[PDB]
Amino acid sequence: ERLLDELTLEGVARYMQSERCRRVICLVGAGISTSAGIPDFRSPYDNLEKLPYPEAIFEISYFKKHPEPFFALAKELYPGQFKPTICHYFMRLLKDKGLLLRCYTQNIDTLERIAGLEQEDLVEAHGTFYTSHCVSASCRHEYPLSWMKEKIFSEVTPKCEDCLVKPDIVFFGESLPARFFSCMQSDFLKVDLLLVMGTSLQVQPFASLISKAPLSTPRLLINKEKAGMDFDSKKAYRDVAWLGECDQGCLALAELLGWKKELEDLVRREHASIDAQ
Ligand SMILES: *C(=S)NCCCCCCCCCCCC
Ligand SMILES: [Zn+2]
């Protein structure tokens, strides 16, 4: 069927306000973090000049051999703060309002957790920095963020005190976490809305999630560029694209839903609180 009254942000807002919209899944990427200062890497180079090919800084095999590049960049690009964005806190609001079924994230910055999404709400599709593991299969010693953070800027390779210690991120050529496949099996059977934010759906198998929803489920993309989705054909019925930055899009949606002050209120204290530390 066709559930949206209009293929626009406004039509999506009206749907979200209705009794029909009970379960929402968010699929998110780099764009939701860029106003928090987290680097994108969708489309960088000069800084890397000191690797056999550029992408190998993000590659599993090279990492095991030559870990220090990656760890050097991690120091270079380490945010001085971790302030979740308007977009992160919009998902927090969905959680508070009993709408958020799951957030599938391509991001490794831990900002969803900081905005108050719980483990059960999240599928960290590309792993996380929140926790790091010894590569030794007979050991697999676990170390926290603060140990990994402290090691990284000391420009020393992190090593296991019992045995290399890797952040739990999925490097190119590495298979995705079990939790991705188990959640995806049931999450999409009964979902009323997909909110796709800050991703161009370029990485697989993350990109395939959008086709998992029922044919009737509306899908809103909030992204800098267009990116199974049919926004513009004579047969378009359920997909809407809002092009621009994620913070501005979520703000416009919040404003349409009557959540603008609420969202603003949430961001202000959460930020000012983080400041105090
Ligand atoms: C896959 S699309 N993304 C998951 C992140 C792991 C692969 C890229 C490594 C990023 C370099 C780390 C920069 C330090 C902030
Ligand atoms: Zn170990």
**Beta carbon of 51 within 6 Å of any ligand 1 atom:** no
**Beta carbon of 126 within 6 Å of any ligand 1 atom:** yes
Residues 240, 15: Cα–Cα separation, whole Å: 12
> Both tokens of residue 105?
């994230």
Q: What is the largest CA-CA distance in the chain?
A: 62
Which residue pairs, CB below 8 angstroms and at least 24 apart, start in 112-121?
112/28, 112/84, 112/88, 114/82, 114/84, 114/88, 114/274, 115/84, 115/88, 115/89, 115/91, 115/270, 116/92, 116/270, 117/91, 117/92, 121/95
Q: Find the angle CA(121)-CA(210)-CA(175) to the nearest 5 degrees.
A: 70
Resolution in A for the shown PDB structure? Answer: 1.7
- What stretch of H or E contains 226? none
Instruction: Give me ligand 1 centre to Cα 97, in Å.
Output: 32
Fill in the amino acid letter for 79.
P
Residues 88, 107: Cα–Cα separation, whole Å: 12
Instruction: List Cα–Cα distances, 52 to 18, 49, 57, 62, 66, in angstroms.
Output: 54, 10, 9, 9, 11
Ligand 1 atom 13 nearest Cα: 74
Residues 251, 147: Cα–Cα separation, whole Å: 36
Active site amino acids:
126
Ligand 1 atom 11 nearest Cα: 58
Instruction: List Cα–Cα distances, 273 to 32, 100, 232, 266, in angstroms.
Output: 21, 24, 43, 11
Q: With contact defined as beta carbons under 8 Å apart, do 157 and 134 qualify?
A: no
Read off φ and ψ for residue 270, nearest 5 degrees: -55, -40
- The gap between the terminal CA atoms of the chain, to the nearest Å, is 50
State which approach was used to obtain the coordinates: X-ray
**Beta carbon of 129 within 6 Å of any ligand 1 atom:** no
264: left (phi over 0), alpha (psi -120 to 50) or beta: alpha
DSSP 163-213: --EEEEE--BTPPPPHHHHHHHHHHTTT-SEEEEES--S-STTGGGGGGGS
Atom of ligand 1 nearest to the CA of 126: 4
Q: Which residues pair with 243 in a beta bridge?
A: 223
> Both tokens of residue 9?
């942000």
Q: Which of 157, 165, 158 is nearest to 141 (CA)?
A: 165
DSSP state letter for 116: T
**Beta carbon of 171 within 6 Å of any ligand 1 atom:** yes
Atom of ligand 1 nearest to the CA of 127: 4
Domain boundaries, the chain: 1-34+85-125+178-277, 35-84+126-177
Instruction: List Cα–Cα distances, 107 to 40, 88, 129, 227, 269, in angstroms.
Output: 10, 12, 10, 17, 24
Instruction: Give me ligand 1 centre to Cα 41, in Å.
Output: 8
